[PDB]
Amino acid sequence: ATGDEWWAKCKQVDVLDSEMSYYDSDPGKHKNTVIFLHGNPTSSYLWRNVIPHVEPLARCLAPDLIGMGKSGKLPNHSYRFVDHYRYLSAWFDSVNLPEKVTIVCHDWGSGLGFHWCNEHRDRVKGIVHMESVVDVIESWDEWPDIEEDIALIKSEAGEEMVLKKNFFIERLLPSSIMRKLSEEEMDAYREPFVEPGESRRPTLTWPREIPLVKGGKPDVIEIVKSYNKWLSTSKDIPKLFINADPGFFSNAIKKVTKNWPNQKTVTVKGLHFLQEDSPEEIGEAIADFLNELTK
Numbered sequence: 666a667t668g669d670e671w672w673a674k675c676k677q678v679d680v681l682d683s684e685m686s687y688y689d690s691d692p693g694k695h696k697n698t699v700i701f702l703h704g705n706p707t708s709s710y711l712w713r714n715v716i717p718h719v720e721p722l723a724r725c726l727a728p729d730l731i732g733m734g735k736s737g738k739l740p741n742h743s744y745r746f747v748d749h750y751r752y753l754s755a756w757f758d759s760v761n762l763p764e765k766v767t768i769v770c771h772d773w774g775s776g777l778g779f780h781w782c783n784e785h786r787d788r789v790k791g792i793v794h795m796e797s798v799v800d801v802i803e804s805w806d807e808w809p810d811i812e813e814d815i816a817l818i819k820s821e822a823g824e825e826m827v828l829k830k831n832f833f834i835e836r837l838l839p840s841s842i843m844r845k846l847s848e849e850e851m852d853a854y855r856e857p858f859v860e861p862g863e864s865r866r867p868t869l870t871w872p873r874e875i876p877l878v879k880g881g882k883p884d885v886i887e888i889v890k891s892y893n894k895w896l897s898t899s900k901d902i903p904k905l906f907i908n909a910d911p912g913f914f915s916n917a918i919k920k921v922t923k924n925w926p927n928q929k930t931v932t933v934k935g936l937h938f939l940q941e942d943s944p945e946e947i948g949e950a951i952a953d954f955l956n957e958l959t960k
């Protein structure tokens with residue numbers, strides 16, 4: 666599936682002072698509804714092979730985060746977590762959702778999704794998460810050691826690596842897919858970022874937001890601490906952790922969430938971008954989880 670084929674399936678809606686593109690399998694319907702949230706440096710395209718296993722049984726939506734995919738670029742180039750959340754929250758209000766929804770989320774889309782869920786607890790039917798932002802990072806001994814990588818990307822070298830050389834798209838993304846993407850698939854990930862410069866700013870600001878304590882991002886830290894406390898104590902919120910083997914953050918997430926209530930786990934093969942290696946197994950697990958929500 667080329668990018669052109671995927672985005673031809675998608676719609677666009679005005680959101681605040683911009684616009685967001687999104688997949689909607691059944692517009693305007695209040696049936697069982699699932700929202701899929703990508704992270705960095707992907708788009709709704711990440712879910713293209715997962716959704717076909719879920720949409721037979723549920724209305725499926727998948728937005729492109731602001732500045733990403735086919736969503737609008739912001740002239741102020743401000744793509745912090747709270748900026749993304751402002752646009753994504755307005756998107757939620759613009760697409761005629763039912764009262765309760767299931768959130769499926771990945772990477773920074775789980776940061777946004779966990780936070781949205783924490784702030785709209787009455788709307789949460791269930792949460793499916795994978796390679797997700799489940800807690801703050803204190804010591805690097807619990808997590809994959811990317812301390813120096815984060816120091817580097819927060820330095821002025823990050824502007825060169827990302828805005829000029831597209832580091833997250835051309836180096837990081839293929840490094841955490843087990844197979845090699847076809848040229849058409851790789852071009853779909855490149856398309857939102859083909860212009861060097863501030864078009865690529867979302868893929869640089871996202872890693873600079875990583876919730877390292879004492880890392881200068883106290884608003885992100887408070888947000889993650891808050892939803893972590895809720896997720897750790899929410900016995901009424903069904904959760905599905907999709908564990909990637911070998912994964913990247915998956916081993917740490919398994920430990921961090923081991924005492925989360927009302928959580929089931931399924932393991933699939935993959936690295937960080939597990940959707941590109943096990944889309945069928947992920948989609949089937951989501952479909953089965955939706956069935957369990959009726960209990």
Ligand SMILES: O=c1n(Cc2ccc(O)cc2)nc2c(Cc3ccccc3)nc(-c3ccc(O)cc3)cn12
Pocket residue numbers: 772773796797798799800811814815817818837838840841871872873874875876913914918937
């Ligand atoms: O902000 C982030 N998240 C968000 C996040 C945080 C905690 C969590 O539990 C889940 C998600 N994730 C990353 C990753 C992970 C990854 C991406 C792609 C390939 C290989 C690894 N890698 C980097 C990075 C890696 C090198 C580098 O030079 C600069 C940055 C940043 N990340």
